[PDB]
A paper describes a structure:
Wall teichoic acid ([name]) is a polyol phosphate polymer that covalently decorates peptidoglycan of gram-positive bacteria, including [name]. [name] is a heterotetramer composed of two TarG polytopic transmembrane domains (TMD) and two TarH nucleotide binding domains (NBD). Like other ABC transporters, [name] uses the energy derived from the ATP hydrolysis cycle in the NBDs to drive substrate transport across the membrane via the TMDs.
This hypothesis is also supported by the observed weaker binding of targocil-II in the presence of ATPγS.
Residue numbers in the entry:
A (entry chain A), C (entry chain C): 1 to 270
B (entry chain B), D (entry chain D): 1 to 264
Write the structure that this text describes.
């Protein structure tokens, strides 16, 4: 109860500092490139292209899903994945990499993974705007339902942030954690509706039911409902919403407790 | 007067490993005993407001550990430290990034130190004037020389106003002209009746700056008191040590390191 | 002609130094892990597992290829890919990361990417021995044809090394190179016989003919011929052998020329 | 006697950029002109065997650039350097890894310096004896203190036997007992009639060690000659500089930096 309050207060009091440090990190990462920050959009785009040639052209022989061309289905479904992947992979390393620069200073230590996540949220927002603009050429124009994004884009961010708040502490105590996530994230990519849709009513039915326990399922399906299908997603799937809210709350609580329990001895493990 | 810093029975221990199997076995088994190294051992001293205290001792004695424990960046294994007032540390190179320019580095480091946006905006021009870089304030710090990096770090760092200050082996930086500026700033800092902890090997600087001496030997507090009663004793010990043979010095160091290691 | 001679002499005179530095690098990379160097085998194994569940169980419904179970086909085909991927990805960064430590010393600079490649060749050799042992449980025992590996395991190494000798120089002059390879290597993974076999005689026939211009095709097919099919591979495909030898020679020549042209000014670009 | 180092018309230039568009336009267009900064400008001096030469000047003068160009780690834009003999540089912290132990670091650094395996095996025990670490030779260097890291680096590095030696602002390290050892080693190095280049701000050390002085001002060679004819002149300039006002010093520095920048 005190750990949650401390972490919440530290994050609420330092909004401007989080944004500024995220911007400085984006500047530092792309310093020597000739193109600069443009790579923050170029790298995610190329990866989508390959994924269209393998799973759309090769497999599926370019077959539409649910009355929509496969290219736009995949485009709307995959826009948030690079943010999640990179945000978790670097938020797990954040404290180990950045503790010594601020240790002598009096600094709110719980905001270190959060600004590392924000530096990737910027590129996610740019890509999502590009995707919405690109969807207008086929004839899919924004509707009233697009307002749902005001709940769905924030939630995604929160989810990622909560995970890092745990995996930053675990990564200081035990370094092997950094090697485990690489294997876990891959499982979360292929067992999700980003590239394919399970058949249901069969041996694929159990796989579908298990897939519904992945939060990426809810994220991709809600984005598609807001942008492509013109539907109010929560009018049929509020139980998944409650399940995912519970997941985020559990991750945040455990991460806050562990972080406030071990933060004073971080110099021992580093 | 009033106690500003109060250190009571501070102890610091470390665990020594040879193979990964030892490390894993210690991590798993609760009873497993291993070698333990005492970096500090039962340090107690009371500091008052306006006291300038200089830390002296040979390599490996434990003065950086004590100044980190006072600074708040490290935690005791046993004992406790009570601070009355805000604490700051002079670490000039900490927040500098070679990718960023000098102007950007000023804001980055001042943000990491805890300043607010309005203060950063107000005090940037004075820092730029002090550092005396000129045009190279508009260039990445990786294009600088060593003296210019030190000058920028010192100019950013000297803008704090704490109640307790900790300096670790850097009183002045740069060429002959910058050193006088740095010394004048430090003397002004002393004038305002602030508590200062100072770690150095320059005994002339210690004689002209400090007022108390803390002698650290083998992780222990050998002596503590006024400068003119304690510094001559350390100097006499130092002059006696140079007059021994190599075997005597090796024996002294081995005897010192014997008491610091214990299996438990 | 002088650049080739200089690089060749520098590599030939320093075999022991290359091996020692590769071993020190392997020690440095895995320092804080509880398991240690075991991860050098654990990480490649897990990635194979996922690739078996997605492409073997999901797609293909576990269908054999060429009279062999799919699991062993994939296992023999994928054993060398992690070495190639990691070796190129880190050999591109080697000089940028390690120039300043040896610049003041008189050091053979052309061997910096090579020992970074050797540090990955170690884990490749361990995994290949494990794969050969695992193939004995089904009833596939070593034959005389296994001696072909004495030509095929070295060639793979040489190929990787040659590429880095170019991409280390290009990565110093232009940093954006480091972002391009990530996208190229992915194309080289899916357009290869590691996971699938093209149909030929159709629209897939042109894809097969283009795939034969990938060196990974030759590497995987030669490994499988030596270990699985009990065939002398060069008795039907010596033209592919000559093509790949020419490729390696071209890469080595261009890399040596550029490296000796620019090495004296590496401090400017770094 | 015999010329050992011969420097002829050495010039070093750098290109100054403000935005990425400028950098790209310069990279593409062959005629595009930009600002250019002259770090060095037409340096010529002849060194003989047995000469100890001390480099003096204010911050940003260009002595590290000259010692890197002599050392071989940097290349001139114009001119040439002729060396007669093998060249070594004292860079103690270069090859040390915190992940490795001390014993491993000895071999790693000696390999990177160019030694053979048999020599490394033969000279490891003497280095271990010199560094005086004791048991901590079996521990990772990241568990050391600063003095012990410096002592290990110096002990590994002092084992070279070159014809030309370059030292950049490190004559002795450690506490009061180690400094005498380091100074004795350096004096032995001078005794063997070896050419030494030395960069420092300590003018007493320069007076007691060097025999020639090279004065660097604004990237140029102000003067060059015997110690007793040149060092008093630099000291007189230095004492005159402290007696100007702040505006005069700013004007002097601005005038100096004016001549170093040129559009071309
Ligand atoms: C592939 C897998 C391989 C194996 C995986 C690793 C096996 C476990 C390794 C144990 C480990 C990882 C964290 C484990 C739990 C984290 C997950 C939690 C759940 C996640 C969902 C910490 O383990 C924790 O150590 C804490 C010590 O702070 C201790 O805290 C509290 O305990 C009580 C209440 O628990 C409470 O009364 C007590 O007051 C607390 O101290 C915890 O109880 C204990 O669990 C790391 O090992 C640690 O290494 C440290 C030196 O770096 C070392 O500290 C130093 O202490 C002295 C001061 O200088 C000095 O002697 C040395 O410097 C060193 O000795 C720790 O002693 C050692 O333990
Ligand atoms: C997403 C894409 C974005 C754009 C991509 C980049 C566009 C090109 C950028 C050009 C670039 C990349 C290499 C390009 C070719 C490499 C691939 C080859 C083929 C691969 C299959 C090098 O370009 C090369 O520069 C060489 C300079 O050494 C020059 O060498 C030879 O030229 C003649 C014979 O060519 C020959 O007579 C001549 O003697 C050689 O000098 C080359 O001709 C020239 O091509 C990098 O830019 C460089 O930046 C350097 C400062 O870091 C800068 O050097 C410094 O020089 C002064 C000394 O201090 C000083 O003033 C400054 O310190 C600085 O100015 C270079 O001047 C500048 O050029
Ligand atoms: C088609 C395909 C199967 C299916 C396959 O091969 N299977 C599984 C059982 C039935 C069928 C068979 O028996 O052949 C596969 O698994 O991976 C692939 C990968 C990894 C692929 O990367 C690239 C392509 C591709 C891209 C463009 C174009 Cl124009 C054409 C191709 C591509 C196709 C497949
Ligand atoms: C089967 C499958 C298609 C094929 C598919 O969906 N297609 C393409 C055209 C025809 C058919 C369809 O119309 O449904 C795909 O593309 O990706 C997949 C990914 C990315 C997958 O990751 C994991 C599985 C999986 C693993 C185990 C088990 Cl036991 C079951 C599953 C998996 C299957 C597919
Ligand atoms: N993580 C660590 N594990 C084990 N021993 C350590 C660790 N950090 C420091 N020590 C030891 O603790 C002792 C005290 O070190 P320090 O306090 O850093 O040195 P010091 O007294 O300041 O002397 P200097 O800086 O070399 S002049 C030394 O024996 C160090 O080797
Ligand atoms: N990469 C670079 N690009 C542009 N200017 C540079 C670069 N490296 C160094 N300089 C400048 O070159 C000049 C000479 O620098 P140095 O020779 O390193 O300094 P110094 O003369 O040794 O003086 P110190 O070390 O600060 S006492 C300075 O003005 C530097 O800012
Ligand atoms: Mg210290
Ligand atoms: Mg310098």
């Amino acid at each position: 109860m005190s750990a949650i309050g401390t972490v919440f207060k530290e994050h609420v009091k330092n909004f401007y500092l989080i944004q500024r440090l995220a911007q400085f990190q984006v500047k530092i990462i792309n310093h020597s490139n000739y193109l600069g920050v443009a790579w923050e959009l170029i790298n995610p785009v190329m990866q989508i292209m390959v994924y269209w040639m393998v799973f759309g052209l090769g497999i599926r022989s370019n077959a539409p899903i649910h009355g929509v061309p496969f290219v736009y289905w995949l485009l709307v479904g995959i826009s948030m994945w690079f943010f999640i992947n990179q945000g978790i992979l670097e938020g797990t390393k954040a404290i180990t990499q950045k503790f010594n620069q601020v240790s002598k200073m009096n600094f709110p230590l719980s905001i270190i993974p959060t600004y590392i996540v924000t530096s990737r949220f910027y590129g996610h927002l740019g890509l999502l705007l590009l995707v919405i603009i690109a969807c207008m050429f086929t004839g899919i124009y924004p509707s009233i339902h697009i307002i749902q994004l005001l709940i769905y884009v924030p939630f995604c961010f929160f989810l990622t942030a909560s995970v890092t708040l745990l995996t930053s502490t675990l990564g200081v105590l035990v370094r092997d954690t950094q090697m485990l996530m690489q294997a876990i994230l891959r499982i979360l990519f292929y067992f999700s509706p980003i590239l394919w849709l399970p058949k249901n009513h069969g041996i694929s039915g159990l796989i579908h039911e298990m897939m519904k326990y992945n939060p990426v399922y809810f994220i991709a399906e809600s984005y598609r409902a807001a942008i492509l299908y013109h539907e109010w997603y929560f009018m049929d799937h509020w139980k998944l919403m409650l399940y995912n809210f519970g997941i985020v709350a559990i991750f945040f609580a455990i991460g806050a407790y562990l972080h406030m329990k071990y933060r004073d001895q971080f110099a021992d493990f580093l | 007067m009033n106690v500003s810093v109060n250190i009571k029975n501070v102890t610091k221990e470390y665990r020594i490993y040879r193979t990964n199997k030892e490390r894993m076995k210690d991590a798993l088994i609760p009873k497993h005993k291993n070698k333990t190294f005492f970096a500090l051992d039962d340090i107690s001293l009371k500091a008052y407001e306006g006291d300038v205290i200089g830390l002296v001792g040979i390599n490996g004695s434990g003065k950086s550990t004590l100044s980190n424990i006072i600074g708040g960046s490290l935690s005791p294994t046993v004992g406790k430290v009570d601070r009355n007032g805000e604490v700051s540390v002079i670490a000039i190179s900490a927040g500098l990034s070679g990718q960023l320019t000098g102007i950007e580095n000023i804001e980055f480091k001042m943000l990491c130190m805890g300043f607010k946006r309005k203060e950063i905006k107000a005090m940037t021009p004075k820092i730029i004037e002090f550092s005396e870089l000129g045009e190279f304030i508009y260039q990445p710090v990786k294009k600088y020389s060593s003296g210019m990096r030190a000058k920028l770090g010192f100019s950013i760092n000297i803008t704090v106003n704490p109640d307790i200050l900790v300096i670790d082996e850097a009183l002045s930086v740069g060429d002959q002209t910058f050193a006088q500026k740095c010394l004048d700033k430090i003397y002004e800092f002393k004038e305002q009746n602030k508590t200062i902890f100072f770690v150095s090997h320059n005994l002339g600087q210690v004689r002209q700056f400090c007022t108390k001496i803390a002698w650290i030997e083998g992780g222990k507090l050998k002596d503590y008191g006024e400068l003119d009663d304690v510094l001559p004793k350390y100097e006499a010990f130092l002059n006696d040590f140079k007059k021994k043979s190599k075997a005597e010095q090796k024996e002294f160091r081995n005897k010192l390191d014997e008491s610091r290691f214990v299996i438990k």
